[PDB]
Structure formats: structure tokens, C-alpha cells
Design a protein around this nucleic acid. Structure first.
Ligand SMILES: [Mg+2]
Ligand SMILES: [Mg+2]
Ligand SMILES: [Mg+2]
Ligand SMILES: [Mg+2]
Ligand SMILES: [Mg+2]
Ligand SMILES: [Mg+2]
Ligand SMILES: [Mg+2]
Ligand SMILES: [Mg+2]
Ligand SMILES: [Mg+2]
Ligand SMILES: [Mg+2]
Ligand SMILES: [Mg+2]
Ligand SMILES: [Mg+2]
Ligand SMILES: [Mg+2]
Ligand SMILES: [Mg+2]
Ligand SMILES: [Mg+2]
Ligand SMILES: [Mg+2]
Ligand SMILES: [Mg+2]
Lengths: 82, 205, 129, 122, 80, 156
RNA sequence: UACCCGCAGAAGAAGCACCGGCUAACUCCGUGCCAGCAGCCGCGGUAAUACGGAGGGUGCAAGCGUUAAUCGGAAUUACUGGGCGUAAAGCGCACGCAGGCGGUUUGUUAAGUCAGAUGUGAAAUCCCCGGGCUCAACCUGGGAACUGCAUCUGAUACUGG
RNA sequence: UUAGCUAGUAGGUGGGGUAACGGCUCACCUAGGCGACGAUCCCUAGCUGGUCUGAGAGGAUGACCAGCCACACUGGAACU
């Protein structure tokens, strides 16, 4: 099914995930329907570290797109922040 | 990754002073800089159109203490940037950490400034930088670190940087051993004995 | 066989300028009059006057400044063997602006500056410099 | 000449075959010497060049040219062959590279030792 | 509204089927020359009110046989 | 004042009854470096005399070119017997992008930024004439406005 | 682990290619069309700046040269951008099908063409403005671009019906 | 210096079959269909975003990555 998950596109020891909606039967960083924000676990201060698109996330969850563990743990942080 | 040899043969080959010496000794007394080095410098060979361009580029490269690959990368960046290609290349060349610290006056020569940069003595905006090619942005704060403020060679360079020419784009203070890069130097601000067009003609090939 | 009246007109005016002719008479047409209007509005020719009831003739009068001809090169770009159509942002620029490129567009036969100001293309006819 | 003719007949290229067919677009090829001997150049200059007819692995048999002075190679010797021909010798299109599996380097060489496979002197 | 193609008929010697030809005017990608290319198609002409030469108008509906997916709508230019 | 420069020297020969007698030819380009340029092709029995012979004729046969502040007005093409030249105005910092006997004459003339290209036979003797005719035939906005009958801003 | 700090000692850390013209770099020694160099022009027959070595010089640099392939120079397949009297290039000539083009005016259609809008032209990649890795390589956000196609609404000068 | 190819072949009626339209298949009828805008045949070749070079137009190319197709000792087949 459609799932909101991550896709590593950084470098060695410097990960950077591109949160995307992709079919479950696909590669980790293969084909995705759309791109929804990004995430960087090593982002420095005074800089964005998470830019999730809550509108698109809600639109996909209304159609049945499941949210993975890390993105589910990040959307709550985004909601708490703002 | 840097020249390790005589510092005056290059100047003799170019024909002019490359500022590779501190300046305590006169350039004429230091060496017989009238002719090219080697056993055939007495003759005056007629230089070709490619020869003059190559000599100009080699003179610039040896003055700024870079290699051919770094010079080509700087030329590519200058051509990528907007405005005068030669002026942009000159500004990028005189934007390195060793070059800016030499202009400020913390090092006797280019080699001394590069060694000081490498040995973790130069700090930019309160941050330790050991890169000789570290570009400096306008409104930066270069400073000698506290441990290296008591260096005899550093203070000798500070006292010897006064009798020569003074750049009008840097804010220097030897009391605290720190300076500020106020603005990017202009072509008129820099030296006027360098033909900018020769380098771009040579690299247009 | 006569297969390009515009090319014939360009050849006639170029030959007249080369041979120092005061005016060049020729059979005329609606497109010829439209091109002559553009040529007169830019000072490349002195004036023109259509004469005739059944077979109208254009009588274009050339202009000579200090002996040398005013028009340097008139080149037919879009010939009736290869049609050339250019958009508003793809119009040519003769001598970086010092020359003109006549273009027939939906609003008529205007020049490069007029076409660019109006914001529409057309198909080019010839370069005049 | 004209676009109407060119649309019917497109402007064909002028592709030319390579001067090293036996390599088959390969920098190096290993071969076994079959006929090592000496030949003479053409009219403009007279000399005695050292050549070797060698059968390549793929199946081609070519004639190379030994560079430098002194070559211990002989029949049934494994050699490495690269491109590059000799102008003053007809037929040769390749060069035997010294320092190969069995091609020994030139003795007492001081300049351009890399082109002849010579160890750096102490 | 519906995408329809107008073209000249070629043959009609088939049961409930004709062969239409479309002349699209395109420009050469290299020389810029404006040439014409044939777009011959097979049309399921039910009740064949068509001869040879008359132009017709067709629309794509669905694959009706192995080598035709177009159907006639109207006949214009019928007079010879 | 002038920026005289020799382009190339060629050695010609002429057979006679007694044998072959040699000779030298010199091509030079001179100019004030602001808006004037001239060429001289001299011949003499020796290199030092031929260069002066070419220089004098180049000095006394100069041509004034109505160039821009640092470049030429509009792109132009010149056609000669065997050489065709194309010159396009570049931007500041590019330099004299030329080759053969074109970059020297362009630098002597006064222009500092131009893209030049040679098509056909690239011989200096013909290419110099081609590249000077290319600068002679071109005009300035004021010059074209004079014959047009309008203003520079109007014919912008 | 990245990173920071103290120890001591200038130590443990530079080679390759070229030097007759193209192309930046010249003098001797050893041979003597033999030994040998070479991408071209070509050198060596006792004064070799061209062979081998030495001295010196030039280029690059933890890299240096050769080889194999691609593009440029090659305007040397030329649509941008050639020629056909003599270098290669007018069928020996004529008729003519398909085809290519087509004098001049009006009205009509708007197919090409011209304007605007919508969808799409994946992400990635290039470019521009910023950021993070001590700089850079590298990563990344936005913008532009993807020069194309289909549809809709108009413009009618040109070509087309 | 590969010029004719195609008889389930083109179309039609009805039956059968696939989740779906379809000579996909069957019986019958019509003699049609493709082709100098290159049919048929031979050699070579995975395609695209892309990469190199080139100012541009172009030329070469399919390394990594990403999207699609095919393959799993060779060939044929079917089931879940
Ligand atoms: Mg390096
Ligand atoms: Mg620039
Ligand atoms: Mg040499
Ligand atoms: Mg080409
Ligand atoms: Mg030709
Ligand atoms: Mg002939
Ligand atoms: Mg002949
Ligand atoms: Mg004839
Ligand atoms: Mg005949
Ligand atoms: Mg339309
Ligand atoms: Mg449009
Ligand atoms: Mg940064
Ligand atoms: Mg994209
Ligand atoms: Mg009409
Ligand atoms: Mg049925
Ligand atoms: Mg090119
Ligand atoms: Mg692949």
C-alpha cells in the first residue's frame, strides 16, 4: 500500500532522509509517488531540520496511506513545535 | 603539493620581484636578479605570443603560491561568476586565508603565512581554520590565537609589515593581533603590473 | 519563372542602390506596398508612390547619404523554399539593433521593435541593414 | 546543396577505420613471439631496425618494433603490445612495450626510464 | 470538442471498413523544411456511404479488429 | 604613441641566370591604440630593412575605425581573397579571443574584448586585409542614424 | 569515531616527462646513415641544441608519460556553415508521372504560423541564489530550466484549403 | 550490391475464449492488406532521464544512480 517513509540521499556517516510517499513493494530510495519535506538528524542549530508537509500527509492518510514509525514520531514533534 | 626549492630562481625567470622574501635585504643585493637563471640567462630570447601568456600565468601562480589545478579551478569559478573574468580571478586569488593574513601582516612571506595557517595559528571569526585555500568573506574577523600571540617571528612580521605598502581593504590591529576584511579589493586597489587578459587568453584554449 | 515577388523587389532595389539609380519602378502588390511602408518609416528609402489602375507599379526612390548608399545589405531570409517562423522571444537582431528584420504578423507587417513591444511573433521576411 | 535534396538524402558521415585493427580498440594485447629478426627502412634513411612478427591472443598476427638497444626476447617469448606505428618502416603498426612479462628493460638507462621499463638507480 | 481527424479515403473494398489517409503538415527537425507525412488508417465505416477520393472525418473509440481503432462520423466533400 | 608590432617574417626566393637570390618580407601592424589601425607589407634583401619598410608604410597607410568604448559596435564579417573573418563584440574581461594574424592587429587597433574566428585559408597576408576591412565596413550608431535621418534613441 | 588537548624532535615523507619548429626550455661528452629518435616536418655519412649520458633549464605534482575510444580544431558531409569553366564536382540532349514551387484582387476557413491559459514534460542532472561538512570535493532548500506534446480561448498579415 | 511481401493474411456474420476490446480462436463469405513517406530480408543493438565534447546547432555514448522491458544451465509446458 501507499506508505509515508524515508529515503537516504546523503553521504557516508552523514544521513539525510527525503520523506516521500511510496508503494510498499519498492526500494528504500527507489520510486515514490510524491515528495513531502525532508529530515536531517545531524542538522545544526539555527537551521531547519524538519519541513514535513502536514497538509499532504493528512490528504494521504485520508486516502489510506500508512505512516511509518520515524515519520509518525516526527509529525508529533512538528505539531508540538508549531 | 607546494614548491620546495629556490625562492629567487622563479623571480629571476619572471624578470621582476615576486615578493617571496620578507624585505629586510634588498632584492638586488640578495641575488643577481637581472637575467634568467641557469647558464644561458645572458642571452635575451624573443618570447612568443604563447610564451608571454605562459610567463604571465606562471608569475601570477608563483606570486599567489598555488598549483596549476587550483589555478584552473579558480579560473573556472571566475568565469562562472558575473562581471570581469580577470578581476574576479584576481579577487578570488587574493581571498585565500594565507594571502589575506599576509596582507594583514601576520606573516613575513607567503610561505610563512601558509605555514602559520597550516599549524593552527590563524582563527577566522573565532574559529580554527588550517586550510591555506580557505576563502574569506566580507566582514570577517581573522585573529592570531592566544597560544600563538607570543611568537617572535609573528611580531617580527607585524613590525616589518609597516614600511611597505598598506592595503586599503583590510582592518588590521597588532595590539590584539586581529583584522577584518572590510570589502573585496578592486583591480585598481591591487597591483597594476599584471596583465589580466593574458591569463584568460591562455586558458581560453 | 517569377516565383518570389518580394525577392524580385529586393533584387531590384539592391541593384538600383548598387548602380546609383534615382528611383526603381516595378510591378507592385499589397505585400510590396506593406514592405515599402516599413522601409520608408525607417529612412531606408526616400518615398514611394503607386501608379496605375489595372497594373499598379511601385516607384521607389532611393536615398543616398554622402554618396554611399544608405542601405548596406538587404537579405531575403524566409524564401519560398524554406519557411522560417519565429516566436516573440526568438526574433532576430540585425547588427545588434542597428538593422531591422521585417516581420509579417497578425497585426500586419511591422518591425522587430514593434513586434517585441506588442508581444507577438510572426514569420520573418528579410533583413535590412 | 538544397534542403529539398538533403531531406531525401541525409548528409552522411565520413567515418574512417582505425589504424590499429588488431588491437580491437584495446590499449594493450599480450602475444607470443614467432619471428624476431632485423629489417631495413625505406629509401630516405638507411639503418637496421629490430622487428618481431608476433601472434596475438585473439588470433591476429602482426609485426611490432623493438625500442631502444638490447633485447633478450626471442621465439616463444611472451610480450605486451601497444599501439603506435613506425613511419620509416612499412607494415609495422604496433610497438612492443618494455618492462612486460618477459620483455626486459634497456640496460644502463638514465633518461626516460619509464618508457623502456628501467628501475630507478640508487 | 471530441478530438477528430479529417482525411482523404484511399480504398473501400472491404466489408464495413475503409482506408483513410491523413496529411499532417510538420516541420523537419533538422533542416526546418515543412513536409507532409501520411497517416493512413483503417476506419470501421459502417454503412459505407463512401467512394474513392472523398474526404471523411473519423474519431477513435476502441479497438474493433486487429488493425483498426477508428470510426467514421460525417462525410464532407462527397461530391466528385 | 603608436603600438607597432611585427606579425611574421617570410623568406622568398627568385631564380636568376647565375642562381637563386633570396629576399625577406615583413608584415607589420601599427596604430595609436585608441581608434586607428594600419597594416604594412614590405620586402627587402634583409630582415632589418624589411621590417622598417613595412613599418613606414603601415604608419602612412592607417585607417580610422569608429569602435565602441572598449569593443566594436556590432558583429561583422569580412571577406577577402582567401580568408574570411568573423568578429563579435564580447563583454568586459573576455580579452582578444583571436588567433593567427588577427589578435595582434586587434590589440594594436584598440579593441580589448572581441570573439574572432577565421574561415577558409588562414594566411596572415590575406587575413590582415580581411580583418581590417571588417572593421572599416562596420559603422557606429551615430553614423547609421546620420544616414537614416533619425536619432540614436529613436533607432535604438 | 569525527573532534579537542599534552610529549618531543625538522625528523618519517618527491618523483615523472620534455628541451630543432609546431610548444615553455641550451651547452659539452661517447659514437659516426652503425648504434638509435619520432605525431608531422625529419635527423645520425666526425662541431648532432633531434641518438645515449652529463650539466643546466621548462611543465606537472603524489602523481608523471605512453597506449585505446569519444568531441573539438575538421567551414574536412557545411540546416546554422561549402563548391561544380580550369583542383573532385552540370547527367550528351529533350519530354514527362509522383513530387517541389508558384503572377494579381476580394470574400470565406483557420491547417501551419502568432498571442494567452490548463495538464503533463518523474525523481535525479545542469545553471542561479543560500546553508551544512574547519575550505573544497560532497550533501542540501528554493528558483529557473526540461528547448516537447495535447486541449481550450483569440489574432488574420503570410503560406495553406 | 535486400523490391516485392502477406492466405488467419485484410474485412464481415455467428459461436467459443480472456478480468477486459481484439482472427485471440473456430465454421462460413468477401480478395483483400502492407509497400520508393522503404514493405520483406541481413548484420548490429536493451530503451529513457542522463554522460563526454562542442559557444551554439550537432557528434559520440548508455560507466554509477533512477524509471521501464527481457532473462535465471538450454527449450517447452502448466498449476497454486
Ligand atoms: Mg591534488
Ligand atoms: Mg565571467
Ligand atoms: Mg622535440
Ligand atoms: Mg563539423
Ligand atoms: Mg569546398
Ligand atoms: Mg575538372
Ligand atoms: Mg585536370
Ligand atoms: Mg551539358
Ligand atoms: Mg547519357
Ligand atoms: Mg490555426
Ligand atoms: Mg502556442
Ligand atoms: Mg560553507
Ligand atoms: Mg527533472
Ligand atoms: Mg489564402
Ligand atoms: Mg466475432
Ligand atoms: Mg565545433
Ligand atoms: Mg542499462
Amino acid at each position: 500500500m501507499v506508505t509515508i517513509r524515508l529515503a537516504r540521499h546523503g553521504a557516508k556517516k552523514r544521513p539525510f532522509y527525503q520523506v516521500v510517499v511510496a508503494d510498499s513493494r519498492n526500494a528504500r530510495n527507489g520510486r515514490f509517488i510524491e515528495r513531502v519535506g525532508f529530515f536531517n538528524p545531524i542538522a545544526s542549530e539555527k537551521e531547519e531540520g524538519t519541513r514535513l508537509d502536514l497538509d499532504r500527509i493528512a490528504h494521504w492518510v485520508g486516502q489510506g496511506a500508512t505512516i511509518s514509525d520515524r515519520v509518525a514520531a516526527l509529525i508529533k514533534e512538528v505539531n508540538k513545535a508549531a | 603539493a607546494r614548491y620546495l626549492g629556490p625562492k629567487l630562481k622563479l623571480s629571476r625567470r619572471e624578470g621582476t620581484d615576486l615578493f617571496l622574501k620578507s624585505g629586510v635585504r634588498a632584492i638586488d643585493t640578495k641575488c643577481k636578479i637581472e637575467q634568467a637563471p641557469g647558464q644561458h640567462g645572458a642571452r635575451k630570447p624573443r618570447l612568443s605570443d604563447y610564451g608571454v601568456q605562459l610567463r604571465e600565468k606562471q608569475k601570477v601562480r608563483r606570486i599567489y603560491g598555488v598549483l596549476e589545478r587550483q589555478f584552473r579551478n579558480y579560473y573556472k569559478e571566475a568565469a562562472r561568476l558575473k562581471g570581469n573574468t580577470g578581476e574576479n580571478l584576481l579577487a578570488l586569488l587574493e581571498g585565500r586565508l594565507d594571502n589575506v593574513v599576509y596582507r594583514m601582516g601576520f606573516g613575513a612571506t607567503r610561505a610563512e603565512a601558509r605555514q602559520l595557517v597550516s599549524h593552527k595559528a590563524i582563527m577566522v571569526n573565532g574559529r580554527v581554520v588550517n586550510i591555506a585555500s580557505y576563502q574569506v568573506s566580507p566582514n570577517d574577523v581573522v585573529s592570531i590565537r592566544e597560544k600563538a600571540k607570543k611568537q617572535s617571528r609573528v611580531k617580527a612580521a607585524l613590525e616589518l609589515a609597516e614600511q611597505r605598502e598598506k592595503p586599503t581593504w583590510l582592518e588590521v590591529d597588532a595590539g590584539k593581533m586581529e583584522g577584518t576584511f572590510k570589502r573585496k579589493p578592486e583591480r585598481s586597489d591591487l597591483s597594476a603590473d599584471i596583465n589580466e587578459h593574458l591569463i584568460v587568453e591562455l586558458y581560453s584554449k | 519563372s517569377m516565383q518570389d515577388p518580394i525577392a524580385d523587389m529586393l533584387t531590384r532595389i539592391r541593384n538600383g542602390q548598387a548602380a546609383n539609380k534615382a528611383a526603381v519602378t516595378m510591378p507592385s502588390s499589397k505585400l510590396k506596398v506593406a514592405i515599402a511602408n516599413v522601409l520608408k518609416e525607417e529612412g531606408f528609402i526616400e518615398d514611394f508612390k503607386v501608379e496605375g489602375d489595372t497594373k499598379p507599379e511601385l516607384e521607389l526612390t532611393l536615398k543616398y547619404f554622402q554618396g554611399k548608399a544608405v542601405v548596406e545589405s538587404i537579405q531575403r531570409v524566409s524564401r519560398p523554399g524554406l519557411r522560417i517562423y519565429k516566436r516573440k522571444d526568438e526574433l532576430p537582431k540585425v547588427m545588434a539593433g542597428l538593422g531591422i528584420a521585417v516581420v509579417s504578423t497578425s497585426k500586419g507587417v511591422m518591425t522587430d521593435r514593434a513586434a517585441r513591444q506588442a508581444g507577438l511573433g510572426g514569420e520573418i521576411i528579410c533583413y535590412v541593414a | 546543396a538544397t534542403v529539398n535534396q538533403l531531406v531525401r538524402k541525409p548528409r552522411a558521415r565520413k567515418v574512417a577505420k582505425s589504424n590499429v585493427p588488431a588491437l580491437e580498440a584495446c590499449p594493450q594485447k599480450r602475444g607470443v613471439c614467432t619471428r624476431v629478426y632485423t629489417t631495413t627502412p625505406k629509401k630516405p634513411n638507411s639503418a637496421l631496425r629490430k622487428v618481431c612478427r608476433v601472434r596475438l591472443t585473439n588470433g591476429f598476427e602482426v609485426t611490432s618494433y623493438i625500442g631502444g638497444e638490447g633485447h633478450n626476447l626471442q621465439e616463444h617469448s611472451v610480450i605486451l603490445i601497444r599501439g603506435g606505428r613506425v613511419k620509416d618502416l612499412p607494415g609495422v603498426r604496433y610497438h612492443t612495450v618494455r618492462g612486460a612479462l618477459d620483455c626486459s628493460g634497456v640496460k644502463d638507462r638514465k633518461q626516460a626510464r619509464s618508457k623502456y621499463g628501467v628501475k630507478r638507480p640508487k | 470538442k471530441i478530438r477528430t481527424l479529417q482525411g482523404r479515403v484511399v480504398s473501400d473494398k472491404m466489408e464495413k471498413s475503409i482506408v483513410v489517409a491523413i496529411e499532417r503538415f510538420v516541420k523537419h527537425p533538422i533542416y526546418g523544411k515543412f513536409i507532409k507525412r501520411t497517416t493512413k488508417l483503417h476506419v470501421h465505416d459502417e454503412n459505407n456511404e463512401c467512394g474513392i477520393g472523398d474526404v471523411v472525418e473519423i474519431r477513435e473509440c476502441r479497438p474493433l479488429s486487429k488493425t483498426k481503432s477508428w470510426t467514421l462520423v460525417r462525410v464532407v466533400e462527397k461530391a466528385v | 604613441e603608436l603600438q607597432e608590432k611585427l606579425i611574421a617574417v617570410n623568406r622568398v626566393s627568385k631564380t636568376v641566370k647565375g642562381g637563386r637570390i633570396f629576399s625577406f618580407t615583413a608584415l607589420t601592424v601599427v596604430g595609436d591604440g585608441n581608434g586607428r589601425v594600419g597594416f604594412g607589407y614590405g620586402k627587402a634583401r634583409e630582415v632589418p630593412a624589411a621590417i622598417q619598410k613595412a613599418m613606414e608604410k603601415a604608419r602612412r597607410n592607417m585607417i580610422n575605425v569608429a569602435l565602441n568604448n572598449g569593443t566594436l559596435q556590432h558583429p561583422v564579417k569580412g571577406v577577402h581573397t582567401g580568408s574570411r573573418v568573423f568578429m563579435q563584440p564580447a563583454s568586459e574581461g573576455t580579452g582578444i579571443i583571436a588567433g593567427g594574424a588577427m589578435r595582434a592587429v586587434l590589440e594594436v587597433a584598440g579593441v580589448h574584448n572581441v570573439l574572432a574566428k577565421a574561415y577558409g585559408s588562414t594566411n596572415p597576408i590575406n587575413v590582415v586585409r580581411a580583418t581590417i576591412d571588417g572593421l572599416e565596413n562596420m559603422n557606429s550608431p551615430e553614423m547609421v542614424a546620420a544616414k537614416r535621418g533619425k536619432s540614436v534613441e529613436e533607432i535604438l
